[PDB]
């Protein structure tokens, strides 16, 4: 049905809306974690 | 904005203003604030922190008491 | 109009021509392999995203297992890793990922039972391997007066993997039923983020299953 | 300029003897620093009678998260110990004067 | 007959009491923890949301049957 | 066969049972917290209202079943 | 038939049981908070009322449904 | 037919279980807070009586519904 | 038939449960306040007495209506 | 069809449910108090025994009502 | 017919429900109190025996009621 | 008919929740007792198993009677 | 008839209150512990998720039989 | 006849609850004791698992009896 | 001890009617209410007496009771402690009087013509507390007084307490107003159930073994009636203060 | 059928295991190298 198709399309839109709120937060979290690993690697190089 | 006064038998440690306290109470860590409710509690050998506009100093109180009003 | 149906099949019997559960498992495996290919060949010293998944999932789970049980997390690392990176992925693929059991000309009981059988085989192999007679300990021994239910405790442990399989099939199937109900009445999930709640519930269920496997292993340790 | 640890060696012994029933009342005599010309002895008790510093001027009910018994058991030894410390330090000042 | 409506009523009633008191206990524990110390509030709220999600899962378990019986 | 009336009666009562004591325990925790930390109202009463909203929302779903009996 | 009478009984009873213990917990926590620190009674009592009203809302929902089934 | 008698019995039983533990924990918290301080004991004693009264009102609703069913 | 007897049984049992559990919390709080500040011994005696008096007030409501069903 | 049998069973069970959950909390509170301080001693014993007898009375009602149906 | 069988089941179940949580609270309070301090072990053990006797009294009352209904 | 199965269901179900949570109360109480003082752990060990045995003695009364219903 | 439908309602609905309160209490205790001691945050989380694994397993024991009896 | 189905639903309905509240309460005491004393470990955990097993034994009995009557 | 006889039968009813209906419709509750009012007036007259600050003399008891009630009302609040004090004192010793006289000899059998016929032997006692009309009137009067006091003190406050409690989103009103409205009906039903329940108990329980069974029952009933009178008197002031607050 | 990706993912898991161990080993080498430099 047309209404069902709109709901299915809207489900993807909600996922994208959720991604916009949370995915950038996760990316920043990974960058902080990766930077910490890089900082440890930098410490090894400096040591 | 509460008058914190860390005192000791040998001398007084500090008497400055404070925004937050991280009190290591015996049965569980408790926070103190500008207009805190009345409390009076024993401390244990542990770690006490105070926040100065977002700066943490580890006083590391080894035991004692505290009275909150 | 509600049209939900049970996808119960026999793992022992040959796969059916439709094989909805098998198809979902194949799709989840393909997606996981695609992610692994994207993160392996295009891997750098400090990758972002590609290595972020590894660092925040595999390393985090290894650290958690070591904290819970160090030197035994290493031994059963493959079991917990297999529980992870799966089931949750199958549910994400089954969370109305463009199909929603529509346009056809974990929830499977057999798969959950097989997973619990693998968990119980992990018990029979590793748990009490350091003792051998550990399974007989505190079970009708000389102190059986205070340990009469010890054999009952073992039966519960035997029933613990079965309950884990039930919890894998349950909730996951529930999410499907709730999505079908929302489609039948009040579509597009619901006023609340039904889809998001279902996804979070599936992820939490997968994490809880992995933690339950690790905790059962630790309990078998002592 | 002694530390309170120095007086602990006698304070804990006195309070242990008190709790065990070996001693029933505790007193302290020290050279009170009345003035730089006069230093007379003064007797004080170490069995807290009503803490007559400011009587009960302040009236705020407190919560005893350790518990009343635990709070009193922990604080009273500390109070008598700081009283002993104050008496000893006053006596040192009187001695030097 | 009406027995199907009785079934739905019983299902929703028994599925609403459980999470109904559950979430209450969830937030109760969270708020005693906060009143004890408003410094770990981030972790407290995260675990509170986890508990709320589990209670909501129980509620959905007891609630979807109400519409399923209608089917 | 007037089972609809008992159905709605049981639905409303046995859906309202839980959120009642849920409200009770959440506000017990909150009044304790305020008796500890009063100015934290801006956050603690927000968590209060969130937990409240879940509870009477579940009860209101029960009420929607009660009205479905009317439907 | 007597189904209406048992319906009203079920309605009022199952809707009143919850708010009873609810009020119990509400004013219990309120009285411990006030005895602990009654300087903030102004708000503690206000919270009790808002909470008392929230549980009484469910109580009167049960009562009014019972009345409606009775008439 | 006798089912009205069952309705009345169920109604009063529900209205009795409801506020029992309620008033129990009410007076428990009251005596607790009084023991914490006999100074503000009068204020808390005044405040707990409305809590007792609300629970009693719910019980009375449960009882008078049974009486209404009887007549 | 014995449905009225079942009504009497339900009334007496489900009206005995409430006060029975409640008075336990009542006197438990009472003895707790005895163990902490027994200075209030007279006050706790009076307050526990009135609290129970409410509890068997509910109980005797249940018992008398149960007799009425049996009458 | 044997309604008196289920009536007696229900009466006994729902009369006997209460005193156990009562007496539990009852003696738990008193024993915690005496562990805190043994001074009250008999005074608390006396406070406890009468409170337990109060629920014993409800147990007596539960047994006696079933006995009347039983003979 | 079968009514006696379910009657016995209800009797035993509703006579076991109460004393279960009863003895649970009994032992929890007793172990907590004896953990507070030794030297009152004999007295807490005597009160423990009193509590288990009082709970198992109602337990055996339900059990013997079911046993007699068995014949 | 299946009323014997209803009897077995009531026997296994009712009378199990009571001891089921009583066991939890017992072990939790013992746990915080030993956590506060581990030197009394031997006495805690002695008290635990006996309390568990008594609550399980109630549970096994619930179970073996159901087996008797099964015959 | 619809007795299988109301049986499905019983199966799914029952076995929800207890696990709901368990989901409450597990995180209540966990957050109390973590606020009391944040250094144990990992271990408290693990001992929270084990309780999750048991209580949700009970809830799914209810749900799986609800689907089995449903089909 | 679906009465056997109703019996099975009711049986498992209360069968998977005993541990529900039990794991809820047991974990609370465990984590609270750990926070109070993190030094003690593996003894609280052994008692923890013993209590979990004893609590869930009743649920297993309920489920297995349900299966036996259902097949 | 034995109670060989005396258990003739048991009979109860919602209410009892009285004579005098020709000139003006009178129920037995009106007769009881008039008697209670007359007793209260007589006690006040005796309590007043010479009124020359006479200590004791049975007037000091009434003075102490009034002083205790005034202290309780003052502790509850002080905005209307003086003006509303007579209103609460009206319920005090009047609800108490209604609770009293229920244990009088043949309180439930007063005015019975006679178990032989019972044609028109309506019991002309009908305890005023044990009548729905009296409790309903008292509760309506109390609710009207509370509403008027709230309107006079803060007319905007009474409306803003509900309509403007939280204008944005939802508000405490409606639910609060509904709760207050139920509060008058709740108070009425409380007096209706109380006293009536005590009388039903004194009838039924004493119908079997009327020897030391009715004694503790009547003691508990008297304590409950006094507690209920005090509870209603304090609850009127509590509702008024909540409206003011 | 479920274990099809278990062993396959094991190689992928084994491949990242060395990287995580290498990153962990760098901290050990960092401490050893830093300590040697100070001494």
UniProtKB/Swiss-Prot annotation, chain A:
Location of the protein in the cell: Cell membrane
Transmembrane spans: 1-16
Subunit structure: F-type ATPases have 2 components, F(1) - the catalytic core - and F(0) - the membrane proton channel. F(1) has five subunits: alpha(3), beta(3), gamma(1), delta(1), epsilon(1). F(0) has four main subunits: a(1), b(2) and c(10-14). The alpha and beta chains form an alternating ring which encloses part of the gamma chain. F(1) is attached to F(0) by a central stalk formed by the gamma and epsilon chains, while a peripheral stalk is formed by the delta and b chains.
Sequence similarity: Belongs to the ATPase B chain family.
Biological role stated in the UniProt entry: F(1)F(0) ATP synthase produces ATP from ADP in the presence of a proton or sodium gradient. F-type ATPases consist of two structural domains, F(1) containing the extramembraneous catalytic core and F(0) containing the membrane proton channel, linked together by a central stalk and a peripheral stalk. During catalysis, ATP synthesis in the catalytic domain of F(1) is coupled via a rotary mechanism of the central stalk subunits to proton translocation.
Protein name: ATP synthase subunit b
Name of the coding gene: atpF
Residues of the full protein shown: 9 to 55 of 164
Swiss-Prot record, chain B:
Major subcellular site: membrane
Protein's GO biological process: proton motive force-driven ATP synthesis
Gene Ontology molecular functions: ATP binding; proton-transporting ATP synthase activity, rotational mechanism
GO CC terms: plasma membrane; proton-transporting ATP synthase complex
UniProt keyword annotations, A-Z: ATP synthesis, Cell membrane, CF(1), Hydrogen ion transport, Ion transport, Membrane, Transport
Domain of life: Bacteria
Protein's cellular compartments: Cell membrane
Recorded family membership: Belongs to the ATPase epsilon chain family.
Subunit annotation: F-type ATPases have 2 components, CF(1) - the catalytic core - and CF(0) - the membrane proton channel. CF(1) has five subunits: alpha(3), beta(3), gamma(1), delta(1), epsilon(1). CF(0) has three main subunits: a, b and c.
Protein role: Produces ATP from ADP in the presence of a proton gradient across the membrane.
Full protein name: ATP synthase epsilon chain
Organism: Chloroflexus aurantiacus (strain ATCC 29366 / DSM 635 / J-10-fl)
The organism's taxonomic lineage, starting at the top: Bacteria, Bacillati, Chloroflexota, Chloroflexia, Chloroflexales
Curated annotation (Swiss-Prot), chain D:
Location(s), subcellular: Cell membrane
Coiled coil: none
Complexes and interactors: F-type ATPases have 2 components, CF(1) - the catalytic core - and CF(0) - the membrane proton channel. CF(1) has five subunits: alpha(3), beta(3), gamma(1), delta(1), epsilon(1). CF(0) has three main subunits: a, b and c.
Protein function: Produces ATP from ADP in the presence of a proton gradient across the membrane. The gamma chain is believed to be important in regulating ATPase activity and the flow of protons through the CF(0) complex.
Membership in a protein family: Belongs to the ATPase gamma chain family.
Protein name: ATP synthase gamma chain
Species of provenance: Chloroflexus aurantiacus (strain ATCC 29366 / DSM 635 / J-10-fl)
UniProtKB/Swiss-Prot annotation, chains E, F, G, H, I, J, K, L, M, N:
GO biological process: proton motive force-driven ATP synthesis
Segments passing through the bilayer: 6-26, 49-69
This protein's record includes keyword Nucleus: no
Site residues by UniProt (Reversibly protonated during proton transport): 56
Topology versus the membrane: Multi-pass membrane protein
UniProt family annotation: Belongs to the ATPase C chain family.
Protein name: ATP synthase subunit c
Species classification: Bacteria, Bacillati, Chloroflexota, Chloroflexia, Chloroflexales
């Amino acid at each position: 049905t047309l209404f069902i198709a709109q709901l299915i399309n809207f489900l993807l839109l909600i996922f994208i809306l959720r991604a916009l709120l949370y995915r950038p937060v996760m990316n920043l979290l990974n960058e902080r974690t990766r930077r910490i690993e890089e900082s440890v690697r930098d410490a090894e190089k400096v040591r | 904005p509460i008058h914190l006064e860390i005192v000791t038998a040998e001398r007084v440690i500090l008497s400055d203003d404070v925004d937050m306290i991280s009190a290591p109470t015996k049965d569980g860590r408790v926070g103190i604030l500008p207009r805190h409710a009345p409390l009076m509690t024993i401390l244990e050998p542990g770690e006490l922190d105070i926040i100065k506009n977002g700066e943490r100093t580890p006083f590391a109180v080894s035991g004692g008491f505290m009275e909150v009003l | 109009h509600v049209e939900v149906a049970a996808e119960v099949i026999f793992d022992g019997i040959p796969g059916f021509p439709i094989t909805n559960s098998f198809v979902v498992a194949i799709i989840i495996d393909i997606f996981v392999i695609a992610l692994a290919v994207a993160a392996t060949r295009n891997l750098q010293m400090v990758p972002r995203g590609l290595q972020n998944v590894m660092e925040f999932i595999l390393e985090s789970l290894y650290n958690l297992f070591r904290n819970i049980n160090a030197k035994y997390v290493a031994t059963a690392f493959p079991l917990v890793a297999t529980i992870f990176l799966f089931v949750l992925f199958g549910n994400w693929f089954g969370l109305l990922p463009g199909v929603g059991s529509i346009g056809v000309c974990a929830a499977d009981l057999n798969f959950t039972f097989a997973i619990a059988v693998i968990s119980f085989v992990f018990i029979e192999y590793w748990g009490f391997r350091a003792l051998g007679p550990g399974y007989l300990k505190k079970f009708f021994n000389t102190n059986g007066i205070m340990s009469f239910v010890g054999i009952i405790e073992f039966i519960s442990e035997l029933v613990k993997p079965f309950a884990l399989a039930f919890r894998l099939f349950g909730n996951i199937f529930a999410g499907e039923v709730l999505l079908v109900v929302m489609a039948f009445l009040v579509p597009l999930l619901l006023p609340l983020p039904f889809y998001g709640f279902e996804v979070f519930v599936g992820f939490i269920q997968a994490l809880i299953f992995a933690l339950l496997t690790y905790a059962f292993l630790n309990i078998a340790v002592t | 300029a002694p530390k309170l640890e120095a007086i602990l060696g006698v304070a804990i012994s006195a309070i242990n003897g008190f709790q065990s029933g070996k001693y029933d009342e505790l007193y302290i005599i020290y050279s009170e620093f009345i003035n730089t010309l006069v230093q007379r002895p003064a007797i004080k008790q170490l069995l807290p009678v009503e803490s007559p510093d400011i009587s009960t001027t302040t009236n705020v009910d407190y919560t005893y998260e350790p518990g009343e018994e635990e709070v009193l058991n922990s604080i009273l030894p500390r109070y008598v110990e700081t009283q002993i410390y104050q008496a000893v330090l006053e006596s040192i000042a009187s001695e030097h004067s | 007959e009406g027995l199907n409506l009785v079934a739905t009523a019983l299902a929703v009633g028994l599925g609403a009491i459980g999470p109904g008191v559950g979430i209450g206990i969830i937030v109760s524990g969270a708020v005693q923890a906060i009143g004890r110390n408003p410094e770990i509030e981030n972790r407290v709220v995260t675990y509170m949301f986890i508990g709320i999600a589990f209670t909501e899962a129980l509620a959905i378990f007891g609630l979807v049957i109400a519409f399923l019986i209608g089917f």
